[PDB]
């Protein structure tokens, strides 16, 4: 093994002309033995040399071979496909439609060393020229869990097909000649083998850490490692980054710890490589996260709002010479958390416009702005579905900046509307524009709020004028919730207070925290209700925990390990070198270190704990 290439994820996307595409495949896979990602071989034409693929031994992702006209794909030493990523929700190997208007193409796919697809299933569809693959026993390649998940179809009546060699297992091969007979290392085997084998007999058993077969009995005799190859041994997991500190009874920094690079364990991340909280070296972070350097090594961390997307806004940029959000408009604002400019909602949206050839927008689509969190210009809403009792699409709007203001006075304006309540429960800053709430003959709560707490420039005023009277709502019984503070309401619900009279639970205003009787049990800190940790055993009619985390339970649900409450006693964890930490539980449920001469684990104290 060695030599590592990144892999591709183009699925069926095509890169330039067929030549362009061939040249990419080439430069990606040229002299590569281990594919960290996936291998997608598609669009390759007649008489294009795919000789370079003779070199590939391990593929980590999946293998996609589709839409080719090549007679021959020489994946001749492909040993394992790990299926760490599936194609089309389930296949680690999909070999789909490799023909052209003629019924020819892939005849030959001589995968004589493919012995294990570790995860995922296998699909073959529409290869009217593919030979011999017909015959394979997938029961030996594919693991039983994905056996009932295959789509298998080879539909030629006759062809350029040589029979297999007489020297073949139940008639299965990948092509012509003895070299192509399927080598079986799991079917034919032995009650005694809990894994793979070198042959029909018990002494032939491969170590459990081997993936495709072995050259002997050891963990250094594997053809391929099932999980990790650390130096020249196969292991279950890389030496941990975190290790167990007997003095803190929790996980500390492990100086002998190794990161994880494909199925390899490395001392450090290569080229330009970020790290994950699986402890892996990778080329780039996932979509639901994106981080920078956090003490030396670049780590990947979570955006816990959907990652910041800066979006134009009505008037400027790509949305220039547009009056408002439209049917034609509103898609272009999907994952957008901030508006670099204004937001207009005008009657023409919900009525539609003959001039600009714009259908009326569907009022359900307004939900696309649930993500918007900052408007930099101003927000102007002069129409709004009457069916909608709320400005709820802006539920999560945190800031309006007013850097530009309507007619040069207004940062927020809510005008001539049917709503009952301003839905703006996340609003906390309107820095530099005036506010206008007008003609909303049903809008009831706008007074309760102290707009002055929201201003950032000391000259901005309000105009809660020409809505309902204070008398009207009060009489309709449309006041703040009894659980809000003088501070106000963005509506009737408890979720809708600016701040709480008594206690907050996460987001809602509430009476009691769940001190003596709640769902999960709680404590209070800064008049908030915070959950007890799941290892605190609930105490009847008494307090259940005394803070955050596991050393704040009055009583552990399961086991005690130093000051921690734990679900299970430490069982084979990495330690401050020479060994794995192993404890048993005493009748008090206290964890205590097993006798050092164990190594297998124990069931009690001393040597009588581990038997032979």
């Amino acid at each position: 093994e060695k030599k590592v290439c990144q892999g591709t994820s183009n699925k069926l996307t095509q890169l330039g002309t067929f030549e362009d595409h061939f040249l990419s495949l080439q430069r990606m896979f040229n002299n590569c033995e281990v594919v960290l990602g996936n291998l997608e071989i598609t669009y390759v034409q007649r008489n294009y040399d795919l000789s370079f693929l003779k070199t590939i031994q391990e593929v980590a992702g999946y293998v996609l071979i589709a839409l080719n006209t090549v007679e021959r794909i020489p994946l001749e030493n492909l040993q394992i496909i790990r299926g760490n990523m599936y194609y089309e929700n389930s296949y680690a190997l999909a070999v789909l439609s490799n023909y052209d208007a003629n019924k020819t193409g892939l005849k030959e796919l001589p995968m004589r060393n493919l012995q294990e697809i570790l995860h995922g299933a296998v699909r073959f569809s529409n290869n009217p020229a593919l030979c011999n693959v017909e015959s394979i026993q997938w029961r030996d390649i594919v693991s039983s869990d994905f056996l009932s998940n295959m789509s298998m179809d080879f539909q030629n009546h006759l062809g350029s097909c040589q029979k297999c060699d007489p020297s073949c297992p139940n008639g299965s091969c990948w092509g012509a000649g003895e070299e192509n007979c399927q080598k079986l290392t799991k079917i034919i085997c032995a009650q005694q083998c809990s894994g793979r084998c070198r042959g029909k007999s018990p002494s032939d058993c491969c170590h459990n850490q081997c993936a495709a077969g072995c050259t002997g009995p050891r963990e250094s005799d594997c053809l391929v490692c099932r999980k990790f190859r650390d130096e020249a041994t196969c292991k279950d997991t890389c030496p941990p980054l975190m290790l167990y500190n007997p003095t803190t009874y929790q996980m500390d920094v492990n100086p002998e710890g190794k990161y994880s690079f494909g199925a390899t364990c490395v001392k450090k991340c290569p080229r330009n490589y970020v790290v994950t909280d699986h402890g892996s070296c990778v080329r780039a972070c996932g979509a639901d996260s994106y981080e920078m350097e956090e003490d030396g090594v670049r780590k990947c961390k979570k955006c816990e709002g959907p990652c910041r997307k800066v979006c134009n806004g009505i008037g400027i940029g790509e949305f220039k010479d547009s009056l408002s959000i439209n049917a034609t408009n509103i898609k272009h604002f999907k994952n957008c958390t901030s508006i670099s400019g204004d937001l207009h909602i005008l009657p023409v949206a919900f009525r539609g416009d003959s001039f600009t050839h714009t259908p009326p927008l569907d009022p359900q689509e307004l939900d696309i702005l649930k993500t918007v969190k900052e408007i930099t210009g101003f927000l102007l809403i002069q129409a709004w579905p009457e069916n909608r009792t709320d400005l709820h699409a802006f539920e999560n709007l945190e800031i309006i900046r007013g850097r530009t203001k309507q007619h040069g006075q207004f940062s927020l304006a809510v005008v001539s509307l049917n709503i009952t309540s301003l839905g703006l429960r996340s609003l906390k800053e309107i820095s530099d524009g005036d506010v206008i709430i007008s003609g909303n003959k049903n809008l009831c709560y706008a007074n309760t709020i102290n707009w002055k707490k929201l201003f950032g420039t000391s000259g901005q005023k309000t105009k809660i004028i020409s809505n309902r009277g204070e008398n009207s709502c009060k009489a309709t019984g449309q006041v703040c919730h009894a659980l809000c503070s003088p501070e106000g309401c963005w509506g009737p619900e408890p979720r809708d207070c600016v701040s709480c009279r008594n206690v907050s639970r996460g987001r809602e205003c509430v009476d009691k925290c769940k001190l003596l009787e709640g769902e999960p049990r709680e404590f209070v800190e800064n008049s908030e209700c915070i959950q007890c940790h799941p290892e605190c055993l609930p105490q009847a009619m008494n307090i259940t925990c005394t803070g955050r985390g596991p050393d704040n339970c009055i009583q552990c649900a399961h086991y005690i390990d130093g000051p921690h409450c734990v679900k299970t006693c430490p069982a084979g964890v990495m330690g401050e070198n020479n060994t794995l930490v192993w404890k048993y539980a005493d009748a008090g449920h206290v964890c205590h270190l097993c006798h050092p001469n164990c190594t297998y684990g124990c069931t009690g104290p001393g040597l009588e704990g581990c038997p032979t």
């Binding site: 183009n10 069926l12 996307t13 095509q14 890169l15 990419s24 839409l67 439609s97 529409n126």
Partner: protein
């Protein structure tokens, strides 16, 4: 740039175009030369 109905309903970027494989019943992109990935979203790392 052009709206393209893939698994994750994105857009082909960097001047690329949407296409349809009729055989499968699946959409994909036709990237301009020198760009990689399903939605053409990445500079080739060598081709520049």
């Amino acid at each position: 740039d052009s709206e393209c109905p893939l698994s994750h309903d994105g857009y082909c970027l960097h001047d690329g175009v949407c296409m349809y494989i009729e055989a499968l019943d699946k959409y994909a992109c036709n990237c301009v030369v020198g760009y990689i990935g399903e939605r053409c979203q990445y500079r080739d790392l060598k081709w520049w």
